[PDB]
Design a binder for this molecule. Structure first.
Ligand code: ATP
Ligand code: MG
Lengths: 363, 120, 118, 214, 132, 59, 117, 121
């Protein structure tokens, strides 16, 4: 499920039928993840093949009207409403409405799933849903549990997320992906509601405000963000250059304290810092600007090998711009072969390397 | 005598000198004797010892005869010290058994019997 | 206006000293006394001396401490700490302050520890 | 003690651990980097000291005292051990003035004897010392201090016996006047024209100081 | 005991250490001096010049900054200096003239700083003769 | 050109030649080891008998 | 957003945020190892972060009874132009106390000069 | 005026000198005064002080006339200084009391009254 996010499709790959959770504090970039995902679907939905498209179903729960009216207005200015379904459940509406919203939208997408297609549904957010449901339950004088949530609160989300899956060939090969959104209170993933959701989903895209402030946007904590399906649902074209990218970043977080000390650091560890600074700088992707796999591979391949280490850590941004435009004019044949084949043969690996070293040289 | 309070203060100075810093002779002296007593308190399970057998061990600890003794030899020393009394000063064991108290005379016979063993 | 001016001052000094030891306790467990300043390091030792001195053998609890009870008068207690504050016993080891009754018994016990050193 | 106070405090201790745990490894690098400046200063030291061996140059029958220290902290008991050694040697000759090299050690002795101190140095604990800097420091000791007049000069430095133990060290610095009265001097040819003894003092004082700091 | 053990070391690098040498030529205050296997114990001050360690094989020649030289009774010469300089492949004429000329202008600058300039002139002039 | 008259100690006499030499070579064969070897940031301060001090100055 | 406040406005605002963040990130080093241990790029940033931080303070005409200083109203057009200049290091000479409780950027230079007297 | 702000700086400097590093003239100057201002604020119970007795003390503090006095001296200094004004410069205390403000003239006399006392003893 190509989200068009480099830090996602490279690090935490999402799969048609998977349940990936977007957990994070307020104002972290949770919606950005999903929102970009939808926009990144114009690459296939305006095509001819159906088993390739992906219809998007957004479930607004507990959000003011002003927000929805804007959220909708953004998808239009990008031509995304053509394949998006909005199930609005504003905060002013009665509690039960905010209770049925997720299930209502659930069915809508299952339709696509049953008929043998692909549908992406984003619950934003389940946190608000539970609050609504808690309200009904308390007013009805039902037993109060941890944090004033009735015992059937877990049965609620478990009976919702399990609805999305990947139907077999006999059933129609249809599929329903779920991206539930949970809002934590100061990073407290130990809370009741979050613990329930995190236990049911199949991976998290943890986001931290801190990482956001530094500049790393979207602030996706590679350390925590995980995916149980992993490569099973990731393009081999990117898998061949991503298998190693998780390694360097891993060792970078361990030797991140050294970066604060003088040059007295040995050369071995120093090398890690050179990469990490740049590899982390590449993941920084502006909002509303999804990139296809054909454009991701070239950037990851140049990063992993270390053709950017010689380049200043200030020019990494413009590097992506001028590099992509280069390929699309001199090596367009390479990009298009990666888009169609989805893999990188020994011939391409050599052709891609030669084209990179050439641009880095002239740079 | 005052073995309990000593140990109480032992952990306070022991856990305070575990930083590696250098100390004076007063604190260091108490630190050496504390370690010997701590190891002497150790005991395997299913190995109950008679009061008569316990009395001797405590005496040596407080006096300091163990201090000179190596730390890794404290265990073997206990099993070897008991055999020394049974093989030699058995009379002392039989006296502490029945009487259950150390007179001013038996106190001296005991000291001369342990000191002589510490030297060898 | 009740226990006397001097008694008030001596007591206060004891508190401040004990307090300064507590406020640096976090530092002690982390770094140690090696990192403590000259002035601070002197207050600690002195403080630790005052704390140990606070202990007192109880006649009722003799069956626990094995040490005969010690009854100290208010008059002597004040002079005692006051003398410790003036720094007239910074040579005596801390152990000599532990479970001690009268201030005289401190110097007495300090001397007994000289013969025990081997 | 609320969940928030424990969560915030527990988090700041963890940061400290990362700061100290990394400080150690970084220290292991500066350690080997100071070995090249330590061995090259000892081997060279033995070259100049070999002369004093075969040629007795002891001192027979006002004193200058120099203490080699740094200015940084978090080094354990280095500013206390040295400040204690100098303190003992100070009880025998209190008149003897002192010139410590280090704002840090300065304050150590500046409390006990703020009189003896008449000169201090700052900005050396940074990197490994060189002869370029060492000879320059020894230069001021002869210009504003006038060490040439002092009958006997003593130096205090920390001799690393091991990576887990140090030993405070002291080594005298014989002056020109003590080079003449050297029992074994006639064995070595020399021309009393180029102030050989005079120029040996201004040089020995530099090298010995460099082998002390390095 | 045959030969003489040489100990040429610096505050940053040690070259020779207990190594037997045939002959050495190091400039002294009194004047240029030479040493061989057995030599009378002499202690002279070394001036900014050029030293050359000789061996049965071709002998190498390095430029010295200055220091002291002492020949121990037991036939052991010890050379102590600050910096060292290889044959000629290390120094450059162009790199010398730049500062050299600037030294004459230091006499023009305040005397406090010109004092050190006079000392530089000498050392620099000798660098030119090393070109040979 | 007297050095021991109005110049500096013998330690400084060889010092000026040490930097002049180290700076008379090639710029290519000049490791950073030599750069910082000629660099120093230490200041000296004369003190009195009463903890007093003089105006700080560069070595 | 760039498409709202202008491209220039966004960049300047983002730089200010990143500066204040690293500052707060090095708070564990500035107390445990001092300011000298920091790198050349770090010290230069840290100083600036302290200037901008104090530069954010502004005297309100409402709380004039608290600060004693007359209110000051800064225009957005000048505001952005002020930090921009400070982000470029054009005022690395001016003292920090010259940015505390100050309105327009001109006042910073005026204040720094009035103190020198 | 900025006394509360100054005491804020004091705790800022007091915490930073915990490191055990030497302090320059600035950080030690404020540290010297800030430490004494905290000692001047200490007042015994059941001992209310008029306005005419608070102004003078705070005056000598915020300015820096106590910097050159030992900490354990600030104690008796307060009582001594008061007794000084009540005996000699009592006219000033009477103006501060009634007026409740400080004129250009009152500052002059008050200034000289302070320095004159510092010189004493
Ligand atoms: N990838 C990005 N690049 C630049 N800016 C971003 C990006 N993602 C988010 N933002 C910023 O985040 C803000 C909104 O963040 P976002 O809506 O993603 O968080 P959220 O999960 O919706 O939080 P909330 O629960 O408050 O809605 C916007 O002001 C926008 O500027
Ligand atoms: Mg949102």
């Amino acid at each position: 499920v190509q989200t068009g996010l480099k830090a996602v499709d490279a690090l935490v790959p999402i799969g048609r039928g998977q349940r990936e959770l977007i957990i994070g504090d307020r104002q972290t970039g949770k919606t950005a993840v999903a929102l970009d995902t939808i926009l990144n679907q114009k690459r296939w939905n305006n095509g001819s093949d159906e088993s390739k498209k992906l219809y998007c179903v957004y479930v607004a729960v507990g959000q003011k009207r002003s927000t929805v009216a804007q959220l909708v207005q953004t998808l239009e200015q990008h031509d995304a409403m053509k394949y998006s379904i909005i199930v609005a459940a504003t905060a002013s509406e009665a509690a039960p409405l905010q209770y049925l919203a997720p299930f209502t939208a659930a069915s809508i997408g299952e339709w696509f799933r049953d008929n043998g297609k692909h549908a992406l549904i984003v619950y934003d957010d389940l946190s608000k849903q539970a609050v609504a449901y808690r309200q009904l339950s308390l007013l009805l004088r039902r037993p109060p549990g941890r944090e004033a949530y009735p015992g059937d609160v877990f049965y609620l989300h478990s009976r919702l997320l399990e609805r999305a899956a990947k139907l077999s060939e006999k059933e129609g090969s249809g599929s329903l992906t779920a991206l539930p959104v949970i809002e934590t209170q100061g990073g407290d993933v130990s809370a009741y509601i979050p613990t329930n959701v995190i236990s049911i989903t199949d991976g998290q895209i943890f986001l931290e405000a801190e990482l956001f402030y530094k500049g790393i946007r979207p602030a996706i904590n590679v350390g925590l963000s995980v995916s149980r399906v992993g490569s099973a649902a990731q393009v081999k074209a990117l898998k061949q250059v991503a298998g190693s990218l998780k390694l360097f970043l891993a060792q970078y977080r361990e030797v991140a304290a050294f970066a604060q000390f003088g040059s007295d650091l040995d050369a071995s560890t120093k090398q890690t810092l050179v990469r990490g600074e740049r590899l982390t700088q590449l993941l920084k992707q502006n909002q509303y600007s999804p990139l296809a796999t054909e454009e991701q591979v070239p950037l990851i391949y140049a990063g992993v090998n270390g053709h950017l280490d010689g380049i200043e850590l200030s020019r990494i941004g413009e590097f992506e711009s001028s590099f992509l435009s280069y390929l699309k004019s001199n090596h367009n044949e390479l990009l298009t072969e990666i888009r169609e084949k989805g893999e990188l043969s020994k011939e391409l690996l050599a052709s891609l390397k030669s084209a990179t070293e050439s641009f880095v040289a002239t740079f | 005598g005052s073995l309990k309070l000593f140990l109480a203060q032992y952990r306070e100075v022991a856990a305070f000198a575990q930083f590696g810093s250098d100390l004076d002779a007063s604190t260091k002296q108490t630190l050496v004797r504390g370690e010997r007593l701590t190891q002497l308190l150790k005991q395997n399970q299913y190995s109950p010892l008679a009061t008569e057998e316990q009395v001797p061990l405590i005496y040596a600890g407080v006096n300091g005869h163990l201090d000179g003794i190596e730390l890794s030899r404290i265990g073997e020393f206990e099993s070897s010290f008991l055999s020394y009394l049974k093989s030699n000063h058995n009379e002392l064991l039989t006296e502490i058994r029945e009487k259950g108290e150390l007179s001013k005379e038996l106190l001296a016979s005991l000291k001369s019997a342990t000191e002589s063993f510490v030297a060898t | 206006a009740v226990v006397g001016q001097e008694h008030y001052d001596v007591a206060s000094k004891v508190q401040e000293t004990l307090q300064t030891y507590k406020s640096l306790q976090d530092i002690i467990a982390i770094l140690g006394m090696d990192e403590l300043s000259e002035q601070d390091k002197l207050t600690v030792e002195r403080a630790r001396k005052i704390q140990r001195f606070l202990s007192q053998p109880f006649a009722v609890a003799e069956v626990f401490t094995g040490i005969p009870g010690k009854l100290v008068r208010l008059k002597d207690t004040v002079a005692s700490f006051k003398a410790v504050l003036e720094g007239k016993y910074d040579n005596i080891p801390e152990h000599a302050f532990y479970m001690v009754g009268g201030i005289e018994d401190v110097v007495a016990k300090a001397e007994k520890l000289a013969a025990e050193a081997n | 003690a609320t969940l928030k106070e424990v969560e915030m405090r527990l988090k700041s201790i963890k940061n400290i651990e990362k700061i100290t745990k990394t400080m150690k490894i970084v220290a292991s690098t500066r350690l080997s980097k100071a070995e090249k400046a330590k061995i090259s200063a000892k081997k060279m030291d033995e070259a100049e000291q070999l002369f004093y061996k075969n040629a007795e140059t002891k001192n027979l029958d006002k004193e200058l005292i120099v203490a080699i220290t740094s200015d940084k902290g978090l080094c354990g008991s280095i500013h206390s051990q040295l400040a204690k050694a100098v303190r003992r040697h100070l009880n025998d000759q209190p008149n003897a003035d002192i010139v410590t090299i280090g704002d840090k050690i300065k304050m150590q002795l500046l409390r006990t004897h703020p009189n003896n101190i008449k000169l201090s140095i700052n900005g050396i604990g940074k990197d490994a010392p060189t002869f370029q800097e060492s000879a320059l420091i020894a230069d001021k000791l002869l210009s504003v201090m006038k060490a040439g007049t002092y009958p006997k000069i003593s130096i205090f430095y920390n001799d690393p016996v091991s990576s887990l133990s140090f030993e405070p060290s002291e080594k005298p610095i014989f002056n020109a006047k003590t080079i003449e009265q050297s029992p074994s001097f006639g064995k070595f040819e020399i021309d009393t024209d180029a102030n050989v003894p005079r120029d040996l003092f201004e040089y020995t004082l530099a090298n010995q100081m460099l082998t002390a700091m390095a | 005991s045959s030969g003489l053990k040489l100990q040429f070391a610096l505050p940053h690098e040690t070259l020779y250490s207990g190594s037997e040498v045939t002959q050495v030529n190091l400039p002294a205050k009194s004047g240029r001096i030479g040493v061989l296997a057995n030599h009378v114990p002499t202690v002279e001050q070394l001036l900014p010049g050029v030293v050359e360690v000789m061996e049965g094989s071709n002998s190498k020649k390095f430029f010295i900054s200055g220091g002291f030289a002492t020949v121990q009774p037991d036939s052991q010469l010890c050379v102590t200096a600050i910096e060292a300089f290889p044959l000629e492949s290390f120094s450059q004429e162009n790199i010398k003239n730049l500062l050299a000329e600037a030294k004459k202008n230091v006499s023009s600058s305040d005397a406090r700083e010109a004092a050190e300039a006079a000392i530089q002139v000498e050392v620099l002039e000798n660098l030119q003769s090393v070109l040979k | 050109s007297a050095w021991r008259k109005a110049g500096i100690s013998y330690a400084a006499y060889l010092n000026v030649a040490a930097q002049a030499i180290r700076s008379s070579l090639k710029t290519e064969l000049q490791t950073a080891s030599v750069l910082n070897r000629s660099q120093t940031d230490a200041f000296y301060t004369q003190y009195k008998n009463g903890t007093a001090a003089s105006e700080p100055t560069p070595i | 957003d760039a498409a709202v406040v202008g491209q220039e406005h966004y960049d300047v605002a983002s730089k200010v945020q990143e500066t204040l963040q690293t500052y707060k990130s090095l708070q564990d080093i500035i107390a445990i190892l001092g300011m000298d241990e920091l790198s050349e790029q770090d010290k230069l940033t840290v100083e600036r972060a302290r200037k901008i931080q104090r530069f954010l303070s502004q005297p309100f005409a409402v709380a004039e009874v608290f600060t004693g200083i007359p209110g000051k109203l800064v225009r957005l057009k000048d505001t952005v132009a002020s930090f921009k200049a400070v982000l470029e290091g054009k005022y690395d000479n001016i003292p920090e106390h010259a940015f505390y409780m100050v309105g327009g950027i001109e006042d910073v230079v005026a204040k720094a000069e009035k103190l020198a007297a």
